[PDB]
Amino acid sequence: TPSRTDPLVLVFVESLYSQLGQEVVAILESSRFKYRTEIAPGKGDMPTLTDKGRGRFALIIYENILKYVNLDAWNRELLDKYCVAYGVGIIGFFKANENSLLSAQLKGFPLFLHSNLGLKDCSINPKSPLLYVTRPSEVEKGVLPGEDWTVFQSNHSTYEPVLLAKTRSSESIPHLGADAGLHAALHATVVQDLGLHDGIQRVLFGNNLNFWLHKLVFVDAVAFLTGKRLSLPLDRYILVDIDDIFVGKEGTRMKVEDVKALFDTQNELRAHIPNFTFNLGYSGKFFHTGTNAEDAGDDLLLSYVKEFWWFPHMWSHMQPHLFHNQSVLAEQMALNKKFAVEHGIPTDMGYAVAPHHSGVYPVHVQLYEAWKQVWSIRVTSTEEYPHLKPARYRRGFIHNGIMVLPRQTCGLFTHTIFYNEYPGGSSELDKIINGGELFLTVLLNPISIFMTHLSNYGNDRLGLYTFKHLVRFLHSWTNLRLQTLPPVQLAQKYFQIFSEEKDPLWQDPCEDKRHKDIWSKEKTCDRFPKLLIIGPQKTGTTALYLFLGMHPDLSSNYPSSETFEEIQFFNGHNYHKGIDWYMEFFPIPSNTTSDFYFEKSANYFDSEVAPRRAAALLPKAKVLTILINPADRAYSWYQHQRAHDDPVALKYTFHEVITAGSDASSKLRALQNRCLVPGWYATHIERWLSAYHANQILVLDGKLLRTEPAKVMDMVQKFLGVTNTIDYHKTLAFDPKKGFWCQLLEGGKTKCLGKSKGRKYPEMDLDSRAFLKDYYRDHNIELSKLLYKMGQTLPTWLREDLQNTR
Amino acid sequence: RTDPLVLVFVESLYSQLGQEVVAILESSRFKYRTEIAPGKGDMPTLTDKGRGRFALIIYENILKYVNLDAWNRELLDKYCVAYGVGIIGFFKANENSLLSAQLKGFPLFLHSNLGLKDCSINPKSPLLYVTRPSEVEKGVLPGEDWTVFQSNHSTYEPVLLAKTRSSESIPHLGADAGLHAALHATVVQDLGLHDGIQRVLFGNNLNFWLHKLVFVDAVAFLTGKRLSLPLDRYILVDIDDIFVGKEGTRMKVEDVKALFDTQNELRAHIPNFTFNLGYSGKFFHTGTNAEDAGDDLLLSYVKEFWWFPHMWSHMQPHLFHNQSVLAEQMALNKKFAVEHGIPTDMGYAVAPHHSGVYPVHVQLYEAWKQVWSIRVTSTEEYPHLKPARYRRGFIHNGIMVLPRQTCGLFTHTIFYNEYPGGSSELDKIINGGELFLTVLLNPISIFMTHLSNYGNDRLGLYTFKHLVRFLHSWTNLRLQTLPPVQLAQKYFQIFSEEKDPLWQDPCEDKRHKDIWSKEKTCDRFPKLLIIGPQKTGTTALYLFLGMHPDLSSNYPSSETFEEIQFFNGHNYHKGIDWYMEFFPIPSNTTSDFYFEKSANYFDSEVAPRRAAALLPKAKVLTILINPADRAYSWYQHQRAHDDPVALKYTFHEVITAGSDASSKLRALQNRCLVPGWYATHIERWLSAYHANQILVLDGKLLRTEPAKVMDMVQKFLGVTNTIDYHKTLAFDPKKGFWCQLLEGGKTKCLGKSKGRKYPEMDLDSRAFLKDYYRDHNIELSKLLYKMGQTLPTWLREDLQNTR
């Protein structure tokens, strides 16, 4: 049976910032394993592990292993009972403590910890079950960084050594017993607890994650203890892009000898990773820059050509975003395509690259259109977002059907030609390879597209050095099946493994200062409305939206007409078309100031998607919901559909719609769902409250909005921080025709809320009112708890209902 | 062990039974926590450090106790066994529920939806230990609903036994039951030896009045009397309106004899019964020859009977501004009292109909001390009209104010009789009603009656004679009479809280607020409190806020201190009205946005609760800087002061020093270290107020650009327009700090005390304070993030570098 505990990882950190806590989190985020961080005091209790029937975390990780061992007797017995009952394993790290004695028996453990050791010459012991998967690896010779290290000693089946190292001193650990041999034994720096007795399996790391081999063994520990409910594939896809072909300063371009060395090294790599190809990024304009030795390089590249893969930059090699006009981008692409055909450099590849490694950001719709039109490229790639790093942080997204992949750095950068400039000298190259960012990128990302340059190539041949040494190091210490995918199938595989990648969320370019600077100035995050009026619909959401709009500072957004009266941009085409199409709608905000913009969609509340999607792009935004008795709101929706005179609302009475069960036809069930689901007000507000700050969220009494709208409008202006408040008692009037309050216009004219909503209806049936009162009883009880916990006011009708039992 | 705290699982707080359960727990005044029992939901962690959160657990609905997930059920049962936490459970009759069902996990069968009659207490149970054994409660128990319990076990002992309404026994009688119906158990005790936890199960809902009585006894029994409510009850009977009333009001000869005879019968019940006679001179001798003979007999009482004045004037202090006119009316009534020879010593009076009690006028309290020297007074209205239980006496101006109780006659209405609620409503408050509950739950009861009342149905005499008889039949409490002044001293000895005056706005009473003029405004009370801690730059923020013309500062008492220190100071004790006079009175047309700044308020425990009671709306603002630089700035402030301790020792010598340090050295240590606390103090404000209510400023930013901090403050206050403080502030290099820019480019800097430039604290003291504040700065970062306020720049820097 499936583990009761979820694939979720519980990570006990000393603090988030703290170096080991951040390294643990960075591995979980890269793996895109789901996790929850808690700060674990030793004293502090463990969070309620279970959620009914299931353990929260299949796996538990203690950054500070002393926080796990030092527990109160009650919380310790509770956690141990959970670990045995659910089979949750524990990963623990030890840090040497100055205060702590060097040698100590671990709490609860027979195990002995010997701390503050220099170590050297680390080896993997095949014996321990932990990393069979990793090949027995070469001995990592030389000095392991850090005095700090802890080694583990115990004799039992319980404890199997995984990593074994020597002390720096030739002499063994001092005051060794007779039993210990003259020669020092290799000391265990990582141990696996079978944990049969405990009932839980553990993996204990002597030293910090920072030491690069601990990051490798930590990935294996998470995989083992989880039960590998989800595992990271052995399989790794590598693409190497050589940007700036026919581009660069003289000498950057490969000479005849450099082009031969590129071809020969491709053939050496291929053995490692099969069907190794090189993907050559070219700019025409730059091309034939070269002199006679560089032009002989260009000739050898084309003699290569059929083998090698090819993609365009711009002849201009300008970033496409800059070029707002799509025809100018398409013309630059068509020139580079003509050169490729003349060359014979394969059109077939149907690959293209953002020029200047840019234009991908901020996402330019004209670039995506021009790429389909001229090159038909399904796939592209970008470093840029959200930033350069985390590498892990960025994930591929799909937009307009084009699959966008995350680009990775060697650590060589365009800006700095020279390795030397790169701080930290030769040891910094070794550090990125062992436990470095480039090593971690291959360890954690199933797919890695490495950016290099031709210009880089004419040089040290640092590109050849880097990849030849990386592949050798990976083969010595880990077993990965290295593959290359043709970029289009690789992208399809990427967005199959990550669903989320498939459906991207994209930040406005503004947020990153450099993305905002590429992006046109006018577009702003601010431009999208600060405030979202989420519903539920038939709140009388259109009346609130109309009355809010009035305040001059406060400006409403221009609804998509097509989608509906309600803007419905999120659900509607507008998102799909893109954020940029919606912003274009918006006029550039006034120069003097930008207006406090707001929108109102029913759809936002109704959709699950809309709350999470809105909170990701504008977490800033104030969120506003309006709750009235859910029966009167259901009846007002039924009377709205009848006004619509849609066939279902004409056919079925409100009582026949709600009563109808599964029997009801799909249209009757859709009407039932629109009556009842939005009824759910507590369930829907809880989703918004899980995303949005309490201050961020305002829950209005919709009874009060109907009976005195001006009191509700004063609460809304305060909640928005609108610059000016409005006395809505002076600007609103009761329209007897409507039977509701409306905006007062000069001349005493009234601008009522939309007729369709709140359309005049017959009295609600008493039997339908009684039926809906009983149907909503438990929903109204949970709404009262939620609003009290918010501190938000409960609806006046809900307080009255919950005071009298009747 | 387990704390006295009670965990109460309600279906809902709101619901009627949930509120009745809570009202009994509150009247008992035992500490409790209400949770809505989730069927699904887990219980909150019961235990803390090895102690149980609640010694006792109560399930309003027993289905909330039985429905658990297997994990949370096993957790709760393990807690109950390990700590001996008892469980009280009630059944609710349910249509859905079967008429007969076995309770889950226990043998005890439930038979539901029964009429019942003729309830008795099983002889084992006292039931109330104190009380004499109760007679069979004859007649019909209300409600179909009832559940009876059946089981064979040592575990289950019957406490209450009743009969079915029908002669025939309840259908599906068990084998155990005989052909004749057994007396069926409506309340059972589970010894819970086997279970490990003792339980008490009540068949029917709390609402039925006898369940409230048995519930008080259940709490007393199961506790182990860890918490108990005193046996002892103090009763005073005030007869208002002596020699007052319309003709015919004055008592008849035979009614006055019956009053005297009944006083002598009551005395037997409780010794040294006294009646306390409230008189108006002016009205006196209204009566004709038979009423004047009543007035004569009243005065023949006089020595025996206790006496108190109602004003001859019956003026309300609101009406006359002048205190001298009130004091003269009081002096005339005092002269009449002496001529009677009515004892001075009691020195007790009450306002007629609590007239002019409120709104509190300072002149009334002054005149009362001056003319009548009354330690004690009483009022019905307060603290709140209801619940009566809610009402607690308070102390103000040294006078002890006691809660008055109704028999149910209402002064407020001209006639209670005339106005509906009827004769049956008086009988209902006496039987298990509000008047009975008032004596049951309130350790001290002052009952208001009237001489005029007597002339009447003599419903007052009926009500109290029947109430006392009913209390004596069914309960035992030790009834006592305490003279009102000693009774008040005893009251405020038993609760400190009452003694500590409760400060409330007039706002609560709409009619009292209306008496008060419009001019008094919210604005006049400082909307904004800058709580500290001090030397954050709270005085700079206060000065720059005041600077905005819309925003007006209060005027610090010269004498009191630079800071108002209202709350801390005595003046707070002096009163809210003295403070409202103090800040300028807002124009009638418009009221200014007033603010004050006291260092104390943030630091003090007292200040959070005191500010939240009076504001309560008011905005609260605190300023946090690196707590080490704030401690060093306080040390350098005391040196400037040249306080002898701060001059003698360096900051490191002050903090290292232990008990060796003298009281002055420890006071300087505390002023350096405590305010460092910022997360601990902000958590108390965050437990009371909305995020909007509270603003936490980055004090490093206020020092380095004050104008950025002033923009955040104006936004937080909701000032209509912000003002650019980058144009009105300037950095004064001499000061080393930002100051107000004046025309001419002159700077108006912070006072001498702060803003002094001194050479930085020593590296060893900085390292020591960094390590000392590490865990405080970590908790501050959590709290500010949860607030949603950003952590200070200095706090982010401090928390990133572990070293």
Side-chain angles (χ1 to χ4, degrees), chain A residues 748-764:
Chain A
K749 305 295 188 180
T750 52
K751 185 184 177 187
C752 314
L753 50 70
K755 181 59 175 61
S756 187
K757 61 171 8 64
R759 78 312 303 148
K760 179 54 205 176
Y761 36 39
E763 67 146 0
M764 179 178 181

Side-chain angles (χ1 to χ4, degrees), chain B residues 271-298:
Chain B
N272 302 300
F273 211 6
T274 324
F275 297 152
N276 191 35
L277 294 171
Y279 69 94
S280 298
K282 180 180 323 302
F283 291 168
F284 142 86
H285 208 295
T286 283
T288 59
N289 291 351
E291 291 169 315
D292 291 349
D295 290 351
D296 287 333
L297 189 72
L298 239 143

Side-chain angles (χ1 to χ4, degrees), chain A residues 17 39 48 50 52-53 74 77-78 81-82 85-86 693 695 723-724 781-782 785 799 802-803 805, chain B residues 11 14-16 36 40-42 47 69 71 74-75 78-79 83 690-691 720 781-782 786-788 799:
Chain A
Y17 319 123
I39 294 161
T48 173
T50 56
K52 176 184 355 292
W74 178 268
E77 199 188 12
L78 191 72
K81 192 182 189 186
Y82 173 77
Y86 291 95
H693 187 73
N695 156 235
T723 60
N724 311 296
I781 289 167
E782 283 306 336
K785 289 185 221 185
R799 295 178 186 234
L802 293 175
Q803 280 178 349
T805 294
Chain B
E11 75 83 4
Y14 252 35
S15 177
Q16 185 177 1
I36 294 165
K40 46 86 209 302
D42 50 66
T47 58
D69 171 57
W71 178 268
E74 198 189 17
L75 191 71
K78 189 179 181 184
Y79 172 77
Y83 290 97
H690 187 70
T720 174
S781 80
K782 297 188 210 182
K786 184 181 177 184
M787 177 54 181
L799 292 173

Side-chain angles (χ1 to χ4, degrees), chain B residues 561-572:
Chain B
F561 239 173
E562 299 295 62
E563 57 176 356
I564 296 71
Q565 194 184 53
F566 199 58
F567 279 2
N568 180 240
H570 288 67
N571 300 299
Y572 180 45

